[PDB]
Every structure is written in C-alpha cells, then in structure tokens.
C-alpha cells in the first residue's frame, strides 16, 4: 500500500517543456486520490491527456483539469459530475501542493490547483490530496507563461500523462 505516483509531460505551444510527477496521498484521501489517478491514466475512457492549464497566476497557482471545456467551466469526476469533500486533514503548506478546485461545498470534479506559494486561506475549503515529487522546476518554468489575470501567453498542455508506480 504505497502511494501512487503519476506524471504529466507538459508542452508549451506543442513544444516539450518537461515532466512533473506527483505523489497522491491515497492513504489519507483515497477517494480523491483515486479520481486524479484514474483521470491521469485515462483508464475509465476520459481524462487529462491533451487538456490545458487554462489559468496560471504567478506567485499563486497553476490551474488545470477542465478536459471538457478548456476554460474552467467543465470537467467531471470518475464518480459523476461532482463528489463530496472527503476530508481536510492536509493543509496548504507551501509550493507544490495539489489541491482540488471547486465552486462550493461538495462540488469536486476534475479541476485542480498546483500551488506555487503558501495558500493557507484555502485550508478547510479545498481538499489537498497530493504534492509535486519531481519537476517542481518545470512548474516554475510554467508559471512564467501566466499573468496577473491568469491568462496564459502560450498554450500549456498535458501532452502525456500516466502512472509511474
């Protein structure tokens, strides 16, 4: 029962940037971790491969996971259109946290943030379920393509993704 590792290979206007890998805390948040894991492998028939990071705010976060509408209005979980907040055990302690985006209580879908700063105001409202394990430098390099209002100056995509172990 070791925690799963997934990877994203990132591209910038189609040109390879690098690989980010993520530990998912399936010991502490198993339902939320499993959703992200299975969206990363595509094993249910849908998932993250080919989808974009639509909102990047330097000094705050990168946001992705909307594989249906590419702009923050879509996505879905492996459990249905939304699922519940599992728990709030883990906190937003610094850069490199993986945490679920939502639109109110019990509205988790497929969208997520990768933090690039400590974001403690999110504690108890957004479920933390993983952390960057390798390639934080590649998250930093993404962040450069963001802007204050979140629009990206180039298209930042998940060119490939899957499970490493």
Author numbering: 1 to 165
The study reports:
Our data show that the S99T/C115S and S99T/C115S/I97V mutations increase kcat/KM relative to S99T by 3-fold and 5-fold, respectively. Alternate conformations were identified using qFit27 and the final multiconformer model was obtained after subsequent manual adjustments and occupancy refinement. A swap of the major/minor states from WT to S99T/C115S/I97V is observed for the group-I residues, thereby directly delivering the atomic structures of the conformations for which we measured their interconversion rate by NMR. Here, the increased dynamics can be rationalized by the ability of Phe113, which directly abuts the substrate, to transition between different rotameric states.
For human peptidyl-prolyl cis/trans isomerase CypA, a combination of biophysical experimental techniques has elucidated general principles of the energy landscape during catalysis. To directly observe the changes in an enzyme’s energy landscape upon directed evolution, we turned to a previously designed second-shell mutation, S99T, in CypA that had three effects: inverting the equilibrium between two states that are essential for catalysis, decreasing their interconversion rate, and causing a parallel reduction in catalysis. We measure the effect of the mutations kinetically, using NMR, and structurally, using room-temperature X-ray crystallography and multiconformer modeling.
